[PDB]
Amino acid sequence: LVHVASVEKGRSYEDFQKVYNAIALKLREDDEYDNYIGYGPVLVRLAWHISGTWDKHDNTGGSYGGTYRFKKEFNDPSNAGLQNGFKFLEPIHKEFPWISSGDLFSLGGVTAVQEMQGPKIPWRCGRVDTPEDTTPDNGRLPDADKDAGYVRTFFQRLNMNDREVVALMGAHALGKTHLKNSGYEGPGGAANNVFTNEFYLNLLNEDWKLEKNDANNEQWDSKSGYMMLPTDYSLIQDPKYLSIVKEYANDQDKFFKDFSKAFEKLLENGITFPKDAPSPFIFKTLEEQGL
Numbered sequence: 001l002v003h004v005a006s007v008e009k010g011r012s013y014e015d016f017q018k019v020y021n022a023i024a025l026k027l028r029e030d031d032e033y034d035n036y037i038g039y040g041p042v043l044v045r046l047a048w049h050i051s052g053t054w055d056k057h058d059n060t061g062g063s064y065g066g067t068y069r070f071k072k073e074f075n076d077p078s079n080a081g082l083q084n085g086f087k088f089l090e091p092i093h094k095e096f097p098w099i100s101s102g103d104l105f106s107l108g109g110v111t112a113v114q115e116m117q118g119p120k121i122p123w124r125c126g127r128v129d130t131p132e133d134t135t136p137d138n139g140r141l142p143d144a145d146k147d148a149g150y151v152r153t154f155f156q157r158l159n160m161n162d163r164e165v166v167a168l169m170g171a172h173a174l175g176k177t178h179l180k181n182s183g184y185e186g187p188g189g190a191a192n193n194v195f196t197n198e199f200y201l202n203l204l205n206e207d208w209k210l211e212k213n214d215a216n217n218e219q220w221d222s223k224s225g226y227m228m229l230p231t232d233y234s235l236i237q238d239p240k241y242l243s244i245v246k247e248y249a250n251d252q253d254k255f256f257k258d259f260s261k262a263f264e265k266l267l268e269n270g271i272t273f274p275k276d277a278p279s280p281f282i283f284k285t286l287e288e289q290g291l
């Protein structure tokens with residue numbers, strides 16, 4: 001199955017920078033959400049979850065078709081809590097009805113990363129909505145109560161290697177787990193609406209204890225009041241992952257560059273870009289625009 005990017009008719013970089021700006025201004029305005037974390041982290045998780053249904057074997061799922069807008073995918077237990085990100089983006093969809101759903105959901109993630117002082121993430125337009133019967137079944141997103149070999153095998157379906165997996169997981173510096181959404185509770189660090197390499201530093205430097213939470217699931221807790229999922233902790237249990245965790249803990253710029261590449265790839269998996277498609281866009285932040 002082939003999904004060819006098709007640019008929204010007549011649109012160019014300036015149109016998409018306007019959408020970026022509207023998302024960014026709303027992120028600034030709606031500061032109170034989730035005890036003043038704001039909507040940045042949930043938009044990053046949304047962009048990942050709409051992309052992470054992809055299957056390299058048959059090109060099903062993926063960001064292209066925008067299928068999170070349909071009940072089956074919206075209601076995936078794995079997506080619990082993401083309705084908050086969807087609701088955030090609704091007024092943006094209303095203001096800019098011409099942008100496709102997959103373009104909007106993925107651009108929401110890019111905008112959140114950059115507005116949270118993360119790396120620039122080049123972004124390409126042209127995802128096209130596909131109908132309800134193209135929605136992937138539930139169960140393609142990963143479980144958190146697993147070990148390193150699970151994580152490695154899982155991410156092969158998304159064509160991600162060890163370095164790409166460890167870089168993508170650095171997004172777990174952002175936001176928090178919520179007991180009602182996932183059966184895990186707590187944040188992973190102190191700077192959880194600023195994009196940094198703190199995930200790796202905390203994995204290496206905190207004193208972690210394996211405890212049960214109030215949902216009767218195991219998670220790793222620090223006396224600092226941080227937590228890691230079992231799949232997060234697996235990155236320091238496996239020797240190959242551990243090497244890369246140490247690399248990103250010791251090189252902020254390398255983490256930013258590798259995350260940017262892996263996150264763009266994640267958001268673009270499944271999409272064929274015509275040879276004459278526009279180059280990827282690099283959006284200016286509000287701060288760079290003096291806005």
Ligand code: HEM
Binds near residue numbers: 041168178179184229
């Ligand atoms: C083995 C892979 C992964 C597992 C099992 C996993 C699991 C989870 C779980 C259980 C939560 C908590 C959800 C909640 O309770 O609200 C969460 C949060 C989050 N995840 Fe992951 N995830 C993984 C990979 C990723 C990746 C690849 C990204 C993006 C690059 C990502 C970004 C986030 C973000 C930003 C949050 C915070 C959401 C918020 O604060 O609302 N995750 N993840």
Ligand SMILES: Oc1cccc(F)c1O
Binds near residue numbers: 069087093
């Ligand atoms: O209906 C929608 C609301 C928010 C974002 C979208 F992409 C939508 O299709």
Ligand SMILES: Oc1cccc(F)c1O
Binds near residue numbers: 173177228
């Ligand atoms: O380990 C974590 C995963 C997602 C969000 C967080 F806040 C975490 O500490």
